[PDB]
């Protein structure tokens, strides 16, 4: 049931000081802690993607590199998860994160992914309810190796930031939800990303996809949709973090961005 259905445009913007996360699982209070890790560099080139459905294959695949900073000001009901892997077919392992209104469900299987994968909602007359279908995400799922269901992390103006790292087998997800007063979507200041979910995956990931929810029309088989999301890339790089008296990373300096920063 794979159709090439979603188009996408891209622009370029500035990361400012976003993408900071807690590097470990240790409380620190009123200290200046220097750590070298996969961080999003300050004031970097971050791609703004507008994914459009109106009622050909125009949704190209992004490389994963060393890790992905993801951001979205759009609400949690249309954007509903991510896809990770290398070839996205039955020959290799594939990882799928799907959020819905009750929980979040994660697979590592061999998915035979479609070229333009999307979760589509439709009403079932036997169940008499609006149910979700993954038949446009993939055609099959066999030899499945991992499954994990937890409380969701896409809930409800609200900027949602995520950091995905793939280090020595573990897929680490960091997240933050920040109420952003009407203005520039990527705001100034610091919002440190708390370590959310560390998944025991152990697969090769060099390419990724982001998963959209599409609604049937019941009035051009799908309702028209729009999504805006920012993608940046992490680098192995040294930060200096300021921990306040409550243990929150409130400020940081990236060492290579400026000579003065390096002096700091």
């Amino acid at each position, epitope marked *: 049931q794979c159709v090439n259905l979603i188009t996408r445009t891209q622009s370029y913007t500035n990361s400012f000081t976003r993408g900071v996360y807690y590097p470990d699982k240790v409380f620190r209070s009123s200290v200046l802690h220097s750590t070298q890790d996969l961080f999003l560099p300050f004031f970097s080139n971050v791609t703004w993607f507008h994914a459009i459905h109106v009622s050909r294959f125009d949704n190209p695949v992004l490389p994963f590199n060393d890790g992905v900073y993801f951001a979205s000001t759009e609400k949690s009901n249309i954007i509903r998860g991510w896809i990770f892997g290398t070839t996205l077919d039955s020959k290799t392992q594939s990882l799928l994160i799907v959020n819905n209104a009750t929980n979040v469900v994660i697979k590592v299987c061999e998915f035979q992914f479609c070229n333009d994968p999307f979760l589509d*909602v*439709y*009403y*079932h*007359k*036997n169940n*008499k309810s*609006w149910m979700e279908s993954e038949f446009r995400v993939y055609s099959s799922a066999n030899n499945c190796t991992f499954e994990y269901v937890s409380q969701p992390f896409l809930m409800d103006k609200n900027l949602r930031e995520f950091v995905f790292k793939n280090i020595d087998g573990y897929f680490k997800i960091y997240s933050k939800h920040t109420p952003i007063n009407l203005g520039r979507d990527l705001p100034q200041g610091f919002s440190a990303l708390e370590p959310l979910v560390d998944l025991p995956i152990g697969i090769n990931i060099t390419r990724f996809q982001t998963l959209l929810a599409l*609604h*049937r029309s*019941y*009035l051009s*088989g799908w*309702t028209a949709g729009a999504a805006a999301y920012y993608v940046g890339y992490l680098q192995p790089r040294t930060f200096l973090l300021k921990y306040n008296e409550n243990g929150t990373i409130t400020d940081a300096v990236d060492c290579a961005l400026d000579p003065l920063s390096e002096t700091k």
Partner: antibody, heavy 128, light 112 residues
Framework: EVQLVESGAEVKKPGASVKVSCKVSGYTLTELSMHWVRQAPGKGLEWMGGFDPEDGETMYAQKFQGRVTMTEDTSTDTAYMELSSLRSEDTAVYYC?????????????????????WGQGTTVTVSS | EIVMTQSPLSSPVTLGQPASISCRSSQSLVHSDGNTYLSWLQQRPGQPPRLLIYKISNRFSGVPDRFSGSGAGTDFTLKISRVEAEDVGVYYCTQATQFPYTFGQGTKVDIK
């Protein structure tokens, strides 16, 4: 847009079941209320039966109960109809109709009734 | 069972003139959802009927603006502003509120 296709016309000796099919394309059948209508030559067209979104599943005519039975194959996305105890007046053109089960967005949706898209009729002939 | 009446049975209409068809129901077609459910269909010889109008006044896709619907309660009218050579055939009014679904006897419209 829902597209409806039909099976071939038939002639049968009275006293046997008739298998009449309607295949749905463009949409899957679980989003669609499915209905069936007869038309005699020289008479007004009246109803076999069809789906009910609420307070039951499938409803039939009062004079045609006990003879019409209705199956839906979700794998092949088909609707089959069986009708037994044929009569010499049953020489008629059979229409398969369909309509959307609901209308609106997932947050605000309302149940729909009606016969919007109609397919081509199949000629049911009862003779010697 | 809801019984309806169609009027007139045969209406000889000249080219271009509007024609009005009355559908009358013995029972009120108001539903618990609020919206009243009436559908008008047009059937050509050699052609299955297609949906001309659904819910009194709302237009189906591909239906031209030459057709109008009006009325409420138990009295409904379908008006054809321009009658052409493709308008010949039998018109039906049907209800979808109360089971069983019953259909009108049809109104035959021709040219001459």
């Amino acid at each position: 847009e829902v597209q409806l296709v039909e099976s071939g016309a038939e002639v049968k000796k009275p006293g046997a079941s008739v298998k009449v099919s309607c295949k749905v394309s463009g949409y899957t059948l679980t989003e669609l209320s499915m209905h069936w209508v007869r038309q005699a030559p020289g008479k007004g067209l009246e109803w076999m039966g069809g789906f009910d979104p609420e307070d039951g599943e499938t409803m039939y005519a009062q004079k045609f109960q006990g003879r019409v039975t209705m199956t839906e194959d979700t794998s092949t996305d088909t609707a089959y109809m069986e009708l037994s105890s044929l009569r010499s007046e049953d020489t008629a053109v059979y229409y398969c109709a369909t309509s959307t089960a609901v209308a609106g967005t997932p947050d605000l949706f309302d149940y729909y009734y009606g016969m919007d898209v109609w397919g081509q009729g199949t000629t049911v002939t009862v003779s010697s | 069972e809801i019984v309806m009446t169609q009027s007139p049975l045969s209406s000889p209409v000249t080219l271009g003139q509007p024609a009005s068809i009355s559908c009358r129901s013995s029972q009120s077609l108001v539903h618990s959802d609020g919206n009243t459910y009436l559908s008008w269909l047009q059937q050509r010889p050699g052609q299955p009927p297609r949906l001309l109008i659904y819910k009194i006044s709302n237009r189906f896709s591909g239906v031209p603006d030459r057709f109008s619907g009006s009325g409420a309660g138990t009295d409904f009218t379908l008006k054809i502003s321009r009658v052409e050579a493709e308008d010949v055939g039998v018109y039906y009014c049907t209800q979808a509120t109360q089971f069983p679904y019953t259909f009108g006897q049809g109104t035959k419209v021709d040219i001459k």
